[PDB]
Each structure stands twice: as structure tokens, then as C-alpha cells.
């Protein structure tokens, strides 16, 4: 342990803290309009065609976001809503998309996870 007399001179205290995903002033979700909807390749162990879109937030920042599930309907003028979660396979992508909200539609014919992916109840 650092000696008791050096603990009065220096006094150990943490930092200003860095955030994992800057979604402003402690806000859970953030709204924004999609600028460019493109397709990008993953890292070294994976090889697929993942759909990523650059979302222009309400603050003025343009960060990338991942689209979950099979099939979507996001255009160049679509008003989407982000979540805030890393994928760790695609570099730069720190956000996720909440489907079933605003302009983002839910996944068709999905029977499993209806709370996430934004799917309604089939009768």
C-alpha cells in the first residue's frame, strides 16, 4: 500500500471517465435520420454481407449503426431510432437499431423473439 503520509500529499482519486457509447446526457435511446445505407465486410474469423447505416443524430454527430435480422426497409430519408450496443466483429460500429419503431419496420414471419426485433403477435 502507498504510505499514509504520501496519501495526504497526493491523495488517490479516479479520472473524468470515458463512455462506451456517447448517447449524450445519459439518454437511453436517441433519434436520427439515416444518411447512407451501405453493406460492409466483417473481421478475420467471419465473412458475410452485413447491413450497416450511418445515422445522423439530433446533436449533429454521424455515427454508424447495425441493423439486426433478415430483411429491412431503410432508405436515404428514413427517420430511425438507435439503441446503444457493440457488435464486436465490425470495426467502428458501436450502435444497434431498434426495429418496429418510427420508420423502421419489424421482421416478417418471425415467431421467436417478439420483444426484440419489433414483431407483432400473429393470430
Amino acid at each position: 500500500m502507498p504510505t499514509i503520509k504520501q496519501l495526504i500529499r497526493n491523495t488517490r482519486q479516479p479520472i473524468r471517465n470515458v463512455t462506451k457509447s456517447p448517447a449524450l446526457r445519459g439518454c437511453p435511446q436517441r433519434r436520427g435520420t439515416c444518411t447512407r445505407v451501405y453493406t460492409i465486410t466483417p473481421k478475420k474469423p467471419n465473412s458475410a454481407l452485413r447491413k450497416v447505416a450511418r445515422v445522423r443524430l439530433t446533436s449533429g454527430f454521424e455515427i454508424t449503426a447495425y441493423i439486426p435480422g433478415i430483411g429491412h426497409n431503410l432508405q436515404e430519408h428514413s427517420v430511425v431510432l438507435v439503441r446503444g450496443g457493440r457488435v464486436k466483429d465490425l470495426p467502428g460500429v458501436r450502435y444497434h437499431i431498434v426495429r418496429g419503431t418510427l420508420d423502421a419496420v419489424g421482421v416478417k414471419d418471425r415467431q421467436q423473439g417478439r420483444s426484440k426485433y419489433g414483431v407483432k403477435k400473429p393470430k
Binding site: I4, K5, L7, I8
Partner: protein, 83 residues
């Protein structure tokens, strides 16, 4: 009223003496003694107390905004550095 003891460091001021009070007090979070030293501007209208004298300070009527304490007694003589 409260009484605090200390040594005079500066005497080059008209009817005012700068008294440095040393106070030893243990830390509530830790255990060891942490020494704090704050200087008080005492009143001396008779200009008897010079530099190096250890006097006790009592609370009284504020003669200015910084001064509120007066020097009433004297416990010992000159305990300073040699010229």
C-alpha cells in the same frame, strides 16, 4: 470564548501583528496527525509584541474585516531565528 496560541511572523504593519497558529489534529478517515497552519491578523494598540513572541489569541469585537482577534497575554519571550 475560544483561545488559540501561536508565534508572530510579521511585525512591519501599523498596530497589527501576524500570528501563525499551529494545530495538530487526527484524520477521521485515516489515523495519523495532519498539521494545519493558518495566520491570524491580531490587534495590538500598544505595539509591545514584536516578531518572534508566542502569544495567545481570544475572540473580540471586529476592528476591521480581516481582524477579529486580540492578543491579551504572553507565555514566553523571543523564539525566532538569529540575526
Amino acid at each position: 470564548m475560544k483561545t488559540m496560541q501561536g508565534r508572530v511572523v510579521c511585525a512591519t504593519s501599523d498596530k497589527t501583528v501576524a500570528v501563525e497558529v499551529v494545530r495538530l489534529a487526527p484524520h477521521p478517515k485515516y489515523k495519523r496527525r495532519v498539521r494545519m497552519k493558518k495566520k491570524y491578523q491580531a490587534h495590538d494598540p500598544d505595539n509591545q509584541f514584536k516578531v518572534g513572541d508566542v502569544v495567545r489569541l481570544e475572540k473580540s469585537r471586529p476592528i476591521s474585516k480581516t481582524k477579529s482577534f486580540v492578543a491579551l497575554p504572553v507565555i514566553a519571550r523571543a523564539a525566532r531565528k538569529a540575526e
